[PDB]
Amino acid sequence: TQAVEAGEKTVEQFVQALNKGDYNKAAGMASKKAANKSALSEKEILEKYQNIYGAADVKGLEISNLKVDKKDDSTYSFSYKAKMNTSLGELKDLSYKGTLDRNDGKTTINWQPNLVFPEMEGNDKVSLTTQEATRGNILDRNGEPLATTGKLKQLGVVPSKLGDGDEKTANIKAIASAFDLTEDAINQAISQSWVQPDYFVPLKIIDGATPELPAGATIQEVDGRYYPLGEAAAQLIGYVGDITAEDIDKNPELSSNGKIGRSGLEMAFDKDLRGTTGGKLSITDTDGVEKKVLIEHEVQNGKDIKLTIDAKAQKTAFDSLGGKAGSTVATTPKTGDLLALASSPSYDPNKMTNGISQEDYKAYEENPEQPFISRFATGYAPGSTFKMITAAIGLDNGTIDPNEVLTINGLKWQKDSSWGSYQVTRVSDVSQVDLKTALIYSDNIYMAQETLKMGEKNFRAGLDKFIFGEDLDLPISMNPAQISNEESFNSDILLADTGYGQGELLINPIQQAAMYSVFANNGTLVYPKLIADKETKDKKNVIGETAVQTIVPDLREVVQDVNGTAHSLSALGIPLAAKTGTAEIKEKQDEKGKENSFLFAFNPDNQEYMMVSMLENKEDDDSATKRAPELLQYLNQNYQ
Amino acid sequence: ETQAVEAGEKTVEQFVQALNKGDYNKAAGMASKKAANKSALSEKEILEKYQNIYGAADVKGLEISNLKVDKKDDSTYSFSYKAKMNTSLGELKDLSYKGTLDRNDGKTTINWQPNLVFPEMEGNDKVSLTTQEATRGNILDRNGEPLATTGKLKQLGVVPSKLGDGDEKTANIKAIASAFDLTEDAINQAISQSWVQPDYFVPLKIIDGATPELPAGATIQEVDGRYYPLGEAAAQLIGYVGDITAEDIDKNPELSSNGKIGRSGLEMAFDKDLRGTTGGKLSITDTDGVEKKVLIEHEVQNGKDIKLTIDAKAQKTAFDSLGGKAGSTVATTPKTGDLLALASSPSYDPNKMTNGISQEDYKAYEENPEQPFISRFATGYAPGSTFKMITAAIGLDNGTIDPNEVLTINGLKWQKDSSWGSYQVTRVSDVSQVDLKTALIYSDNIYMAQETLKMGEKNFRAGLDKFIFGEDLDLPISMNPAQISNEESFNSDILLADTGYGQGELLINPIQQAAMYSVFANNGTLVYPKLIADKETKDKKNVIGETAVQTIVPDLREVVQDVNGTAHSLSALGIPLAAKTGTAEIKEKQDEKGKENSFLFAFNPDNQEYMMVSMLENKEDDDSATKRAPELLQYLNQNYQ
């Protein structure tokens, strides 16, 4: 109907005008206080919709069902349902019944308080008496908190105490310099709506101590989420952020204000960690009387999540990367307990949840070393540490014998001229190489040569006993690990490189530590485990016991022999079986790209700890085993 | 070894697919620049030569052949393929191409030169345009009156956003439909259609005669198009045409790159003869204009005309007499088999199927439950009680039916025993003592089923196999051979008795029904129907004996002349008629309960000059095909004498 075509539109656009918080568009389109029915004056919605929704912060009003009929010559009526979300939880449902007005295009709604709530007599106030639930903690193995609530410093200003003029602008400068803010953020944080110069407007939330206080600045205590390790655990733990309307749209069960996880475990365990706040609306009628309030809730605190993480080992693993790109995973391999999941470089989770400028958020996003990435959950080529695996498969299927002695001359080898420029590279020119020599000197030519004999079928049959393609039961995103891009290599180069961990393998450090724990479990593979009360899951006979008793003594010699590639760790005087690794990522736009350093290490005398550590795009004499000591000493002092 | 030439393979394939779809940006988007060992021109100077030669000839459908990619150097390559190409003038078959590739950064590049596009020239020349279009031929009726023709038309329509907005928008629809004999929701329907929007011109109606002053939004366009004088009344037979799709040229490589093509009916069946061959002189040249050799040269030849047996006025009379109901009607001259009328109702307007498609309306009346796209005259049905005359004819031939035999039938329903359950053959008039002639007059199904059971199944099939069951008729109409049954044996007394009066698994379309019923106008000879006027008459001798004809036809006149005949209303016409009515209820051993159909067969038994059969699906009683018969009958009697 062309006459009332603006009758369906001019109610839903008002409902969305209340959704986005612009109450004056809503309270700007009413006729007057005419006697139909009463109703209420044009300018007497001044404190209404603002002082009732300031403590409520209600958003998410949606209709989903609109059909308007006719009643009189000048009356069209409502009868439909709606829902919304306020500070006290979900309010479903709402029944709306209101009348229209007959005008020349100005389809004016005759609002009376029945259209806000399904019954409202008039001229009455409310009482909130709210109580706020606390978010659940995230604890380590020993109950040390990785995410909890702390007392923070709320920084703000009141505009009247800054003065006027060049003295006021100089105070604005002094605030911006002291609070590490901009002048423009302060100027339109103040110069906005709802402001009057004696109002305390907030500007920033600090975890550390109070800075310099120029005239106008104002300090307050505030309760918020705190991360005692911060950067050292940021990618794992994540951060929380304020509720937006878009999260209300995905899950209307949420509140209107409050916190929501945006990454890491805070997003992964958001439902368990959140809980529900307490308090009720309590519409009075200016004497103490209560009518009745329909949909309401009680208080319920969030639940705690306890991890297998060792906080001190997490910090030692992160600090040992020295701000460079890399990742470190440590486990107790008999159990699968993830002791540390460090990813570097990292971001500051406290500043991300306490208000971070767009300056710094893009500086984190502009950083080519990508500090937002969970590198322990990112697939890499494992590097030449993976020689342990193919050696193990070779001792299982009878194609690799430890007495076999290959003659290799030089540093470079290719199968024929068909390989063109590509050739397998090694570091030490050792003429006579058996398997133990290959493992001590990290000889890639030996294993690639012994991967082409014992070809693809024997090789992939050994690899298929591992966890390739499996989704691990962990609260981390984690692509499954792949052998190669396709079901077959279709080339000797790819097979040969797969033999020493290059090529198209993609294995993240966590599933990399899963595959490597067979050397501490006599061939049984023990799955990683992050939640401290999940029961252990293994997978038996992935490799044979005799492969383990052949390889692990040679991995001891990787440390103990002066020619060992991890001989520097011999100086620590602790029992170690180790494997170093390289991987050359070519980045096929220029030649001779970046090289990553790897270290696998565990204690072979008690099997109580294991570590895999990646250092990505190393520089000269910089390696993952150079960075490993302080974590190793910690692990064997405290995991025996 | 190396995979560089597989990138050259995919590059040549993407280059061909970019030339075929027409995007000359991507065709010149992976070429080199002006050099001595690279592409001959720049990027903006290669698109300039495609859009005025390939785009001028509307070059579509490059089909690749035996693509060889090899390697003579490390930076340059050598590819040599064969192909075929479709032009405005038709199709060139055998030609050889070659070229050289390039390597910069892992992705490969084609080094262009002006003989990869034409196999003998080198550069510095242009060719355009030299085509001479041909006209599609006519489909004519028996007397030269056209049923499909090409010529100039005037059609009306609307164009947004010159319809406007607000009420002033709908204010323009109130002036159009008022002035051009239309409705308003149809105007709102054609703008609410698919992606075609807004500056396209959306057609509404063909305008005859002078153009009035137009209201806002109204748009008149003059087009040289395909027209159908009878419209819906022959839409199923004639069909409609559309534009030539790349799919249509993939199925037939001999077609020209553009033009019109039949999409249904006779226009599809005769498309090659109806179209012609364009003329032109697409050649190779130099910059001045002198030529060395030619590529394609053909004298233009317009499409040929195809004269049918159809009578335009009888066809229109047969279609209007169905009154929009579901049904069919076939009319012939039985001595020669000329198909005078082939009417199928309901129908669609073929002029709107050519002048636009109207996708939202296409799906609207192709999922119409009355399914008007179906050519019901080529669709197999149960022939109904009319088929008794065939069973009688077989019975008097093989001796198992004698006219003097009187059965005693009491009631209106009959079954052989109770092993038939609830099923019973039904009659309409409760006549106690019924001979063959009584059973043809009153249309008594119970006499015929009884006499069919007494006759063998082998006696019955032996007579049926002298008809055209399983034969492919030599007609340019798609149809299935008519069937006696789903299986070679009935293996059921119910199925056999019902087949005896035209029900069961018997499937015969109205054109096949006219062919079988022609024995009664040719003394037992079956005359095959023909649709093309010049085709020789085809017959089949002694399908039934002539004494059976001289027994049955005197009874068919009394179906009209006797007060109890089921076609006695036709006796008011005062014209000599022999007739047989029929019914068929849609329920058998292996189907769902549906409706009732109302058949009529009639012809002149004095001069054997015309014959009709009409079906009228979903009778909805107070109606029958005998009720809708008389106007086509008076026309046939006056014009085929």
mmCIF file of C-alpha atoms in Angstrom, chain A residues 46 230 299 518 525:
data_model
loop_
_atom_site.group_PDB
_atom_site.id
_atom_site.type_symbol
_atom_site.label_atom_id
_atom_site.label_comp_id
_atom_site.label_asym_id
_atom_site.label_seq_id
_atom_site.Cartn_x
_atom_site.Cartn_y
_atom_site.Cartn_z
ATOM 1 C CA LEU A 46 15.299 14.023 27.914
ATOM 2 C CA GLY A 230 52.093 -11.048 29.296
ATOM 3 C CA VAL A 299 25.094 -14.155 39.631
ATOM 4 C CA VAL A 518 58.655 -42.227 20.290
ATOM 5 C CA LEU A 525 53.825 -42.205 20.299
#
